[PDB]
Amino acid sequence: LYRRVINRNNRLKRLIDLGAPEIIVNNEKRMLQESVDALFDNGRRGRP
Amino acid sequence: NSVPGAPNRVSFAKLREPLEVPGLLDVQTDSFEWLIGSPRWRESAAERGDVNPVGGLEEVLYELSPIEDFSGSMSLSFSDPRFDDVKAPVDECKDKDMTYAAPLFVTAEFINNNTGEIKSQTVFMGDFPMMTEKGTFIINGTERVVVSQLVRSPGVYFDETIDKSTDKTLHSVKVIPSRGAWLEFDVDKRDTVGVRIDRKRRQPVTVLLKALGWTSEQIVERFGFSEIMRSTLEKDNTVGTDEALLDIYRKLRPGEPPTKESAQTLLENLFFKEKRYDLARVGRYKVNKKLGLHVGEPITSSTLTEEDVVATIEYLVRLHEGQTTMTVPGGVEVPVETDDIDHFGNRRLRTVGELIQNQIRVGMSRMERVVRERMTTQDVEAITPQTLINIRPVVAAIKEFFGTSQLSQFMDQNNPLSGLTHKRRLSALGPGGLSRERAGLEVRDVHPSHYGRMCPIETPEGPNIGLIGSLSVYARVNPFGFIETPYRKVVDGVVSDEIVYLTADEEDRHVVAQANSPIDADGRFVEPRVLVRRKAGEVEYVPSSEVDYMDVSPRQMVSVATAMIPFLEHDDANRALMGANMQRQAVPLVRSEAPLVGTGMELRAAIDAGDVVVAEESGVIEEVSADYITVMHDNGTRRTYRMRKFARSNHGTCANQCPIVDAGDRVEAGQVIADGPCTDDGEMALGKNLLVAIMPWEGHNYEDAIILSNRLVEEDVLTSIHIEEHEIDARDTKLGAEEITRDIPNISDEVLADLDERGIVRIGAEVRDGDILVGKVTPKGETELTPEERLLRAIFGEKAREVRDTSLKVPHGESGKVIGIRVFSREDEDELPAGVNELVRVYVAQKRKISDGDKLAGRHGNKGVIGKILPVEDMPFLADGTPVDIILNTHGVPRRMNIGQILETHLGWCAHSGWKVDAAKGVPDWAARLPDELLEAQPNAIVSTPVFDGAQEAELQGLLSCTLPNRDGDVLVDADGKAMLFDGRSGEPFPYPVTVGYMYIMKLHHLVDDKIHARSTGPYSMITQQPLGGKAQFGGQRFGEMECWAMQAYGAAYTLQELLTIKSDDTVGRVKVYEAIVKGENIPEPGIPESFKVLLKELQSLCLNVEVLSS
Amino acid sequence: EDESEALRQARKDAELTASADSVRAYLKQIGKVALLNAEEEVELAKRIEAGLYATQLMT
């Protein structure tokens, strides 16, 4: 889970620094939110 | 009888059995035969459904083929599944740990519809594990057994419910097909209906029937009598087929805009397409029977059809009207009733064939996906089936099934009965089943349909009670997955020999009679009223002329583990249950004396358990030896049975096989040649015949305790050979290589005496707890060499000893002699796992004698540990002077309701002392129905007693009356069973006589040697510093919160804090306490537990600012 | 059928759904831009060439 968090955060950093259309940035931010979600409480929201 | 080498077992049975018990392994062998499609199974279906003779593999291959591309101009098909000879015979695959398996071959047809070319390539499908003659698979050397599973057969299930508000009845349906989306049709709380599709709570039937190409006229024509559905159709509020389709699209696939054609094709792809909704071949026929759709048509088009839906609607709506019979337009009439989910007509049995079929189906689905991906990426005419095929997922799926799956488990083999009962056992947990937490109270109960199909007694006492059971003795598995039992059919009060087989649902429409009925040999019961089993499981009286079926025999409702209990009908159900369960866990002794009193099922159970050598072909014996037997058949050729001596069972017991034939005898095909672990003369023998007095003796047999005489210890009556194995492997490592060598650092010589220069213990050498077994030395690498170590070597001249001696040592608390050493290595060109290059396994055996704490039990539910083994002097002895062997308490038998074993005791004494009934002035009144040849019995004569048709009270009393003595003139026991006996402690006779007699006792596999454990300072876990748990690890007893409650209630605070902090957790506390107690100093103040700090850090990691404040 | 308010707001409401599954929501969103052909690709490439040329001129 920590590796997933790190990967999502690093990819979001790359997306922001590079400059990407807002749909991909929003998708990455959603993935970051869901990854922190899984880290704190897996299966609380959606399929675990 | 009817067995060539059957010992003369006289029987008290009154009536005869029309058929012999079938081979009790037929549910494992026949299913695998169906799976493979062997010629035996091929001819088996020739008269039992030859309308479509097809195997499981053939069925899967035919369903898979043909597979094509998106264009349809190029495709592949599969056919001709042909097997091959097994790679190696069973014993060698059990030796070097390889799966008993054979290659699988199939033919692949490559078609190219664009132009047309043929490519018939015989592709190697993989390595399919095979089933041995005993019905057990071998995986990686280990012997694994798969068990059948009980699941709800896919189909249609109507049910009734009370709203509990206005007491209105409601009827619901759940068409539950395998691999598909559910439909739940019901009548809602209000008048309209609910048509829940895939868990969406809207849209009554109005949109569904409209979506099927109909309109209001059809739904009003079909339903004018059902005012409920009339009100519903009036409340349609939607007009238009496309409108209904889009409304369905709302609650079937939201998130995507609908179109005119998307919903119409979506419905077909969801329900009427056999790729996303395919109720299995069982489900289609179950639906047809439930609705009368097709009554004489072959089985095809497994996908659900529209007329099925309309028939479901009609059936449900008529059920809500209280109607009795429904006649679907275009089909036969079917009675309307709710469907029970536990009735064995709705619970199927997935045998080994079905489970392996499902796993192969998953593998072939992955195969189809990968081949569909690959057939397009490559240009036409440059593509071949071999490159279209990548057999990896199929073998991956079979390996996934056979290992790390809870439905194919390690064989429970510590006696022939345990092996017999592990197979032919019905489970309910696993994939597609229900977990114990998921299991309610209703499922665990015994259904009236369990009779004759599944035994109602044999089931474990633990949490799994009722979830898993055992097959009956006469039960049969239909070629359709449903269970089925035989029964004789009586006509106009004439009993026929013709045996017909009925399932659970076919029993309701008939009336079966009592098993033991007063048959007059002309088929007519003497009284009109006979105990019969009605449609709904009700038992009642009924005249004879209208009954149409009878049980084939008594003990038809009971399994094979419970059919071995004498006087079963005199025992409570609970005690019979526990007795049947302890029969499974007896140990193989070194002599295995046959029981005096038993049942005819022991012979068959021993014979077909597969572990007794049976002469396949008749002929004279050429030669006999302990290792092998050479038998000369009549047709010139001979055959050598290689006996298996001292083999370790899966539970570490003995499996010796002693031949019981001579060098010049003649043996017939089917006669027992050699005995297994727990067999005498080819019949089951799980215990010993011990003389029993039932008095309570001085409190040493208090609270189910049992006392024994030292004769059992001295004469080795109850002693078991136990064998353990110790694997140890030397593997490659970055430090270099680990050597199996005697260059073991810092060891003495008296412990090096019993090792060969190869580095392992000499064969036939005694070891004990702590002794070294293999000398394996690993490069230690580096560490902090203590300065004190340097001064140590400077005082003696000791070398640095650059390697670490992690040799294999005997674990705590065992000993014995070594039996065998097996060594494998890479330079032996063996198939070792990648990484290891030596692997040696040593077998150590000890003749475990009987001591205090070992559990002994009868087969009647009475159990208990050995309270004491007191010498032969201190044993009550009869007037003849023979001391009693085992004494049990008298305060358990009347309260616990197991009086059957007292009758067994008396019958055993009669069978031992011998008897004769004086036939001078005719036969006595009690012996009139007693069969001939039972009026005379020599001393130590074996008898038999069928469980439900056995010796009655009057017959046993009469037998007890005349019990002729052996050598002297001394009728030790009186007519009422009790006998005088002299105290061995004080010497005076006991004031009152007590019952004595021979009882069959068995030693259970719960010996105290494998049950004693203790530790002072062992290892600890990683995350929390608590000590580990178990016997393999050094353990440490769990001091749970429930015991914390007791210690807090006592008011003892220092003891509790000690048990928590320093004794378990506080590391510095642990080491300081140990130092203080060794130094003879006062134990210091306990510190802070480490687990609390772990919790604090964990809570901090959860973004919770938690700080502890001093002030 | 398709017109007369039966299917238009039907499509709007079907698209405007919770979409609990994240992959489902992403696939719903990606179902919003039409596919492209060669002429559109070369025209957008010309536009990007002009944009980067203008960025170089700004630099």
Coordinates of N, CA and C in Angstrom, one line a residue, chain B residues 134 413-417 587-594 602-603 605-614 629 643-647 649 653-660 672-686 721:
Chain B
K134 N -7.0 -46.9 -5.2 CA -7.5 -46.6 -3.9 C -8.4 -45.4 -3.9
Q413 N -5.2 -40.6 7.2 CA -5.0 -42.1 7.2 C -4.1 -42.5 8.4
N414 N -4.8 -42.9 9.5 CA -4.1 -43.5 10.6 C -4.7 -44.9 10.9
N415 N -5.7 -45.3 10.1 CA -6.2 -46.7 10.1 C -7.1 -46.8 8.9
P416 N -7.4 -48.1 8.5 CA -8.2 -48.2 7.2 C -9.5 -47.5 7.3
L417 N -10.2 -47.4 8.4 CA -11.5 -46.8 8.5 C -11.4 -45.3 8.2
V587 N -5.5 -46.0 16.6 CA -4.1 -46.2 16.2 C -3.9 -47.7 15.8
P588 N -3.0 -47.9 14.8 CA -2.7 -49.3 14.5 C -1.7 -49.9 15.5
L589 N -2.1 -50.9 16.2 CA -1.3 -51.6 17.2 C -0.3 -52.5 16.5
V590 N 0.4 -53.3 17.2 CA 1.4 -54.2 16.7 C 0.9 -55.6 16.4
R591 N -0.3 -55.9 16.9 CA -0.9 -57.3 16.7 C -2.3 -57.2 16.1
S592 N -3.1 -56.2 16.4 CA -4.4 -56.0 15.8 C -5.3 -57.3 15.9
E593 N -5.7 -57.6 17.1 CA -6.6 -58.8 17.3 C -8.0 -58.4 16.9
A594 N -8.6 -59.4 16.2 CA -9.9 -59.2 15.7 C -10.9 -59.1 16.8
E602 N -17.4 -55.0 9.0 CA -15.9 -54.9 9.3 C -15.2 -55.6 8.1
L603 N -15.6 -56.8 7.7 CA -14.9 -57.5 6.7 C -14.9 -56.7 5.4
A605 N -15.4 -53.4 4.9 CA -14.6 -52.2 5.1 C -13.1 -52.4 5.0
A606 N -12.7 -53.5 5.7 CA -11.2 -53.8 5.6 C -10.9 -54.2 4.1
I607 N -11.7 -55.0 3.5 CA -11.3 -55.5 2.1 C -11.2 -54.4 1.1
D608 N -12.2 -53.5 1.1 CA -12.2 -52.5 0.0 C -11.5 -51.2 0.4
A609 N -10.9 -51.1 1.6 CA -10.1 -50.0 2.0 C -8.9 -49.9 1.2
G610 N -8.5 -50.9 0.5 CA -7.4 -50.9 -0.5 C -6.0 -51.2 0.1
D611 N -5.9 -51.3 1.4 CA -4.6 -51.5 2.1 C -4.3 -52.9 2.5
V612 N -5.2 -53.9 2.1 CA -4.9 -55.3 2.4 C -4.7 -55.9 1.0
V613 N -3.7 -56.8 0.9 CA -3.4 -57.4 -0.4 C -4.5 -58.4 -0.7
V614 N -5.0 -58.3 -1.9 CA -6.1 -59.2 -2.4 C -5.6 -59.8 -3.7
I629 N 5.2 -61.9 -1.8 CA 4.5 -63.2 -2.0 C 4.5 -63.5 -3.5
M643 N 5.2 -56.8 -0.6 CA 4.7 -56.3 0.6 C 5.4 -55.0 1.0
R644 N 4.6 -54.1 1.7 CA 5.1 -52.9 2.1 C 5.2 -52.9 3.7
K645 N 6.4 -52.7 4.1 CA 6.8 -53.0 5.5 C 7.2 -51.7 6.2
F646 N 6.6 -51.3 7.3 CA 7.0 -50.2 8.1 C 7.0 -48.9 7.3
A647 N 5.9 -48.5 6.8 CA 5.7 -47.2 6.0 C 5.0 -46.2 6.9
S649 N 2.6 -43.4 7.8 CA 1.4 -42.9 7.3 C 1.4 -41.3 7.4
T653 N 1.9 -43.0 11.8 CA 1.7 -44.3 12.4 C 2.3 -45.3 11.6
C654 N 2.1 -46.6 12.0 CA 2.7 -47.7 11.3 C 1.7 -48.3 10.3
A655 N 2.3 -48.9 9.2 CA 1.5 -49.4 8.1 C 2.2 -50.7 7.6
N656 N 2.5 -51.6 8.6 CA 3.1 -52.9 8.3 C 2.0 -53.8 7.7
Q657 N 2.5 -54.8 6.9 CA 1.6 -55.7 6.2 C 2.1 -57.1 6.4
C658 N 1.4 -57.9 7.2 CA 1.9 -59.3 7.5 C 1.1 -60.3 6.7
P659 N 1.8 -61.1 5.8 CA 1.0 -62.1 5.1 C 0.4 -63.1 6.0
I660 N -0.7 -63.7 5.6 CA -1.4 -64.7 6.4 C -1.7 -65.9 5.6
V672 N -8.5 -62.4 0.7 CA -7.5 -61.6 1.4 C -6.2 -62.3 1.5
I673 N -5.1 -61.7 1.0 CA -3.8 -62.4 1.0 C -2.9 -61.9 2.2
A674 N -2.9 -60.6 2.5 CA -2.1 -60.1 3.6 C -3.0 -59.0 4.3
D675 N -2.6 -58.9 5.6 CA -3.4 -57.9 6.4 C -2.7 -56.6 6.5
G676 N -3.5 -55.5 6.6 CA -2.9 -54.2 6.7 C -2.5 -53.8 8.1
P677 N -2.6 -52.5 8.5 CA -2.2 -52.1 9.8 C -3.2 -52.6 10.9
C678 N -4.5 -52.4 10.7 CA -5.5 -52.6 11.7 C -6.4 -53.7 11.3
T679 N -5.9 -54.8 10.7 CA -6.7 -55.9 10.2 C -6.2 -57.2 10.7
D680 N -7.1 -58.1 11.1 CA -6.8 -59.5 11.4 C -7.6 -60.4 10.5
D681 N -6.9 -61.3 9.8 CA -7.5 -62.2 8.8 C -8.4 -61.4 7.8
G682 N -8.0 -60.2 7.5 CA -8.7 -59.4 6.4 C -9.9 -58.7 6.9
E683 N -10.2 -58.6 8.2 CA -11.3 -57.9 8.7 C -10.8 -56.8 9.7
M684 N -11.6 -55.7 9.8 CA -11.2 -54.6 10.6 C -11.0 -55.0 12.0
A685 N -9.9 -54.5 12.6 CA -9.5 -54.7 14.0 C -8.8 -53.5 14.5
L686 N -9.5 -52.5 15.1 CA -9.0 -51.3 15.5 C -8.6 -51.2 17.0
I721 N 3.7 -48.5 17.2 CA 4.9 -48.0 16.6 C 4.7 -46.7 15.9

